[PDB]
Amino acid sequence: VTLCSPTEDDWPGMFLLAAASFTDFIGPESATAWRTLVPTDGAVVVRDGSEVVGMALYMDLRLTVPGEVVLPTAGLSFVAVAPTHRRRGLLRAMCAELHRRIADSGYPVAALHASEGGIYGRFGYGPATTLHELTVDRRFARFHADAPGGGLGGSSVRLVRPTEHRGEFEAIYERWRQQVPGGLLRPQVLWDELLAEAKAAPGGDRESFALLHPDGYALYRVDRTDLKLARVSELRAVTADAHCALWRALIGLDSMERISIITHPQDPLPHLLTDTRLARTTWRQDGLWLRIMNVPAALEARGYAHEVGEFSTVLEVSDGGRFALKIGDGRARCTPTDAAAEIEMDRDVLGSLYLGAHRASTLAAANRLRTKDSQLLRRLDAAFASDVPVQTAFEF
């Protein structure tokens, strides 16, 4: 039982572990298209002797952080251990090895989508974003008088087939993912897989449809079993007008009873209607997890709030070291130090705070970050707060 990099002979064996560990595994076909994003020396395997019984890999992704700064991010995926080799310490060996490779490759941050909220708590990964499923009873849904595009006249939204307007979607998404914190770059290979999942599979999902705006798009599909529910798989909108214009079209679906969308907590849809409660939050869960690899490099690259007063403090990470942090006028200075620490927090506590979805005061009451200065807490709350609402791009 040892650890090494995989070969071409290992890939048929890696699909077998994937299909048995992941129920939503996209088959042996699509995993090759996802492989084009995995860099060389970006995957680890464990053999027994010998059959492959452990695997874990990261992808080269581009995550947008607050202040429209794009960071190279290691996207952890395909992390699976055979049921016959658990409790031994294969995950502990694989994840510790990959982080060593991620740190050598020069990645400031590492990210993943968790299957459970307890596996990746100690590994330094913290829930950085929040998924927020909204379900709208569209039969009662009526827009507020203040909602944009209230008058009569040719609406700027069109009902189009998703595969026939690909070039337009790639352009809109690119404009979205650069200005919205949490946005990820979608390469050519990922549009290939997303657009192939739009056509109706025999015995699977229904045919997807698209609503097209010059500054946004809605990618929806009717549920296979619930023929009265339209499930919006994707909603990208650049302008505030584009968001409202796409929803007037979505509630326009007179064939449907309900419209469901997995979105972000600060979605302005509830206020867009007369009855705010008609946009019910049916489901809430953490989305994208973050592990800050390079502490000073990640904190400096992020954009902060201009509203907060200029302050300086010494921050301590569990086993990441001790860092001096200077925040003022939107930008931050971060350099390694050894002066007396004011705030003490674990590696995963910084992960949650980074994108600004979780307040430090909330984590302080939970005693996840410790400080004797209560005024410093109020300043970290304001400084880490993102100007543009945090969103989850896509699952990987």
Ligand X SMILES: NC[C@H]1O[C@H](O[C@H]2[C@H](O)[C@@H](O[C@H]3O[C@H](CO)[C@@H](O)[C@H](N)[C@H]3O)[C@H](N)C[C@@H]2N)[C@H](N)C[C@@H]1O
Active site residues: 120, 396
For position 24 contacting ligand X by CB under 6 A, the verdict is yes
112 phi and psi angles, rounded to 5 deg: -160, 160
Ranges of H-type helices in the chain:
11-21, 27-35, 90-105, 166-179, 188-196, 240-250, 269-272, 295-301, 347-354, 360-365, 374-384
- Asked whether position 115 contacts ligand COA by CB under 6 A, the answer is yes
117 touches ligand COA by CB under 6 A: no
Of 295 and 385, nearer to a copy of itself (C-beta) is 385
Amino acid at 57: L
CB of 83 to ligand X, least distance (A): 14
Tell me the residue number closest to ligand X, measured at CB. Answer: 79
The two most distant CA atoms of the chain are separated, in Å, by: 72
Give the chain's radius of gyration (CA, Å). Answer: 23
159: which strand partners?
Answer: 211
Q: And the tokens for 175?
A: 């404009």
- Residues between 73 and 92 with contacts to ligand COA, criterion CB under 6 A: 79-81, 86-92
- Check the CA dihedral 343-344-346-347 and report its sign: positive
Of 219-258, which residues contact ligand X (CB under 6 A)?
none
Q: Which does 305 bind (CB under 5 to 8 A by kind): ligand COA, a copy of itself, ligand X, none?
A: a copy of itself
Binding positions for ligand X, 48-77, rule CB under 6 A:
76-77
d(CA 288, CA 150): 36
3-state secondary structure of 275: coil
Residue 240 Cα distances to 67, 215, 246, 267, 305, angstroms: 19, 9, 10, 11, 21
> Does 46 contact ligand COA by CB under 6 A?
no
CA distance 232 to 243: 13
Binding mask 42-81 for a copy of itself (x = CB under 8 A): ------x--x-x---------------------------x
Select 63 or 114, whichever has its Cβ closest to a copy of itself. 114
Among residue numbers 6 through 45, which ones bind a copy of itself (CB under 8 A)? 16-17, 19-23
Residue 256 Cβ vs ligand COA, minimum distance, rounded to whole Å: 9
Site residues (vs ligand COA, CB under 6 A): 21-22, 79-81, 86-92, 114-116, 118-119, 254-255
